[model samples]
Target: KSCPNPGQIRNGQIDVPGGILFGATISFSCNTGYKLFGSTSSFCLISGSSVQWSDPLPECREIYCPAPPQIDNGIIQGERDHYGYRQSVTYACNKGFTMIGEHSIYCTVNNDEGEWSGPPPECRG
Candidate 1:
């Protein structure tokens, strides 16, 4: 898995304190504005009483959204905004006109309970 450019894994390795005897399990996750692309967990293996462990590496991928909604006459003033699972872009219409639709949305993972958020926000005029 790959995380966005700005996001990174908190730690470089998984900790197997018990050396695989206790059936230790490690979980990994990526930073915001990225999607996980690899294994989330790796288990320790024991062979002939020898303990072995493997890192659970997960990558973050930058989420790309459609271009900002077009306005008859307007300009954007700043870089795009990114949330953990979503990305957002703001727009400023000319001296007149108005903006519509959700200013931001998220591409979130479903919770264990089975509910998930939608993709990045879409700004329309």
Candidate 2:
């Protein structure tokens, strides 16, 4: 028997880590800032049933946040080179300054991508 291409994923790569024949198995991964909505698992069952692919097809949708804000005279504790969803950072003022906003801001999701709960804290004289 033979098998056709699993199908296409936008902003993603189909991984044929291992597969063979009509009983071939598969997996896919999305771009750095995106995620697979279906069949990212090797357990996907395909057949004359490329069935899953035939219906709606899989999607690689965005699922992350950009870098946290930078403020003057303030230090963001627990800093990282990258940031994603559902995560937070703490802000502190300089030794002689006082903070005038959120000390801690967390990422939140409403219907789509991630967003900060509020603006970063500001340092005052």
Candidate 3:
């Protein structure tokens, strides 16, 4: 029986038995900052001397934050519509302005949909 190894998944891994056989099981998992977007497990089925997966391969998706918080009187660098987990945004105040609060915010998976690690920074002249 022939078993195919699913290609690499970003921040994810598949667990399969050393010997692929009928009824063997395959499982998937994602790293701390990632999420699984499909079936978690698949079973190997016998198919006329070939082995087929009972379920399609699952995907490991980067968990993203809705958006980076806005900074007042400053501009944020590395901004994006959605920030993936562990992604960071750096803030810089306008000319002659001083910053208050953290100058950088990072996306984290501590909550659903991911969230910024800290409040947005403020700039004061």
**Top model number, lDDT:** 3
Residue range 2-22, candidate 1, lDDT tens digits: 111222354333333433333
Cα deviation at 40, candidate 1, in Å, is: 1.9
RMSD of each: 8.7, 7.2, 2.3
lDDT, model 1, position 69: 42
Task: Work out candidate 2's RMSD over C-alphas.
Answer: 7.2
| Cα lDDT of model 3 by residue, 1-125, tens digit | 54666556668888876545667788888887788888898877876667787787777777888777677688987577778877889999999899887989888887446887888889999
The candidate, 2 or 3, that scores higher on lDDT is: 3
lDDT of 2 by residue, 12-122 (tens): 887766653444566677766566687654433464546333223468876656678988998888786655665788999999898898999887655557678899989
- TM-score winner between candidates 1 and 2: 2
Leading candidate by TM-score: 3
What's the CA error at residue 94 for candidate 1, in Å?
2.6
In model 3, the clashing pairs are none
lDDT of 3: 0.78
